[PDB]
Amino acid sequence: SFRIEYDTFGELKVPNDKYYGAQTVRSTMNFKIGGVTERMPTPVIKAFGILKRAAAEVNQDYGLDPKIANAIMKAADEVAEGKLNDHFPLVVWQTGSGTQTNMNVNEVISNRAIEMLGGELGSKIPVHPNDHVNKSQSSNDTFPTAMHIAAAIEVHEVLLPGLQKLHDALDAKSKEFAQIIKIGRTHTQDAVPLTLGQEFSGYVQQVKYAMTRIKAAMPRIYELAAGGTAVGTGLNTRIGFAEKVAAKVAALTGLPFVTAPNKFEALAAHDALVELSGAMNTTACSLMKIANDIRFLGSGPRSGLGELILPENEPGSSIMPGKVNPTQCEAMTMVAAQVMGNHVAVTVGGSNGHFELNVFKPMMIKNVLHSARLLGDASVSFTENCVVGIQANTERINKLMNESLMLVTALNPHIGYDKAAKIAKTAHKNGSTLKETAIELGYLTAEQFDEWVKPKDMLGPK
């Protein structure tokens, strides 16, 4: 149930049902770090299929046999569509250039193309992993290209649409809560009123600005290293390959990829990934604040803040009515913490390039893709399983507005500062309301209190 292949170090058993070859088996033997959960992220694998599909078509310009190119293109399409994920067993913790994964991409695409052509698996005929599938490319400029394709597609498909959905649901709730006045909190102390809508509109703005920040990190991610070859000069590739492969990847993906203007900058560093991680890191801070607020605003039922009633998506206890754990807030704030740690990992790698090549590439793109997927998915989950079903506990909020000591300043132009203060002090001492106290002190009538103390008039400048 295995075939025998060879590398210059010896013979290796390759399972008959696997499209990878000797280079990949050897790689598995030498990089056993962390297990299966540490396998190279699927979006990197798919991005490699896109790049190899692109290169094969372009290389027809540079002597690649059209019949061989087309089988390569078809096989690379299968990789890009996620039909061959089981033929990539290598972990992130390999070489820092991601060379093993490039070799394994080349082998899988070679062997599947060979199969399509009716050839023998493991024979390198008629499709050679290096000479055909890796034609005009280098170990050093392929993985970086795969990283950026992967990141851009993830931001485009997962991260940004997730945040947009969250934005829209937060905005919708903002409008729904536009007339519900509650007591502000500063330093967590009671403070002057604001609407739930105003408070939520802050969250909306943060998510809005988060999307702008992420978008602003994308132009440098669209720059591709393909064509720099070994050290940046483009030695051993062809004139035109850099520009054509970028345009081809752009046509296949519909994203505006271009070749990096400076290939030395593109190979020796991944500052673009650091900046993209940076924008996600800010996004995590916004989302930590939005989810934690909502967590606390939904606390109760009676020893908390109790402003919000959160959807209950999973069974509680009938003898515990009103008690609902803010589960999605917890998922979201945990993601937020992860992103911040991922950002430090990304940063340490990005800072440690040496001369012509940064060799921390797999760990950098892992952490960027991890953060982008978590943020996107959590946004969608948080939206659908919490935000959209949020209701205001208007009964409890109205009660707490009436029990507040904050509104007492509304009395000042009518009874003066000292009578207003004495009302607040006495209410504070007796555990009664401003109105009850103000009446008992004979300072005003109930009818006067209602006319003079209007929360709706305490929501803006004059």
Q: Where are the domains of the chain?
A: 3-137, 138-406, 407-458
Other C-beta atoms lying within 10 Å of the C-beta of residue 37: 6
Binding residues: 97-99, 128-131, 138-140, 186, 318, 323-325
Both structure tokens of 11: 């013979």
Binding residues for substrate: 97-99, 128-131, 138-140, 186, 318, 323-325
Cα(356)–Cα(349) distance, integer angstroms: 15
Nearest of 122, 137, 148 to residue 64 by alpha carbon: 137
3-state secondary structure of 324: coil
Q: Burial letters for 64-73: b for 16+ Cβ neighbours within 10 Å, e otherwise? A: beeebbbbbb
Cα(309)–Cα(294) distance, integer angstroms: 10
Q: How many residues does the chain have?
A: 462
Nearest of 79, 84, 72, 50 to residue 126 by alpha carbon: 72
Q: Burial letters for 341-375: b for 16+ Cβ neighbours within 10 Å, e otherwise? A: ebbebbbebbeebeeebbbbbbbbbbbbbbbbbbb
Superfamily classification of domain 3-137? Fumarase/aspartase (N-terminal domain) (1.10.275.10)
Superfamily classification of domain 407-458? Fumarase/aspartase (C-terminal domain) (1.10.40.30)
Half-sphere exposure of 24 (CA within 13 A, CB side): 27
Q: How far is CA 259 from CA 60, 153, 225, 246, 265, in A?
A: 19, 17, 6, 6, 12
Other C-beta atoms lying within 10 Å of the C-beta of residue 398: 14
Give the method used.
Answer: X-ray
Half-sphere exposure of 237 (CA within 13 A, CB side): 29
Determine whether 3 is exposed, middle or buried from the number of CB atoms within 10 Å of its CB (0-12, 13-18, 19+): middle
Give the experimental resolution in Å.
2.1
Interior angle at CA 45, CA 101 and CA 40, nearest 5: 60
Residues with a known catalytic role? 187, 317
Q: Does domain 138-406 have CATH number 3.40.250.10?
A: no
3-state secondary structure of 86: helix
Cα(457)–Cα(99) distance, integer angstroms: 66
Residues paired with residue 223 on neighbouring β-strands, in sequence order: 258
3-state secondary structure of 235: coil
Nearest of 348, 389, 368, 325 to residue 169 by alpha carbon: 389
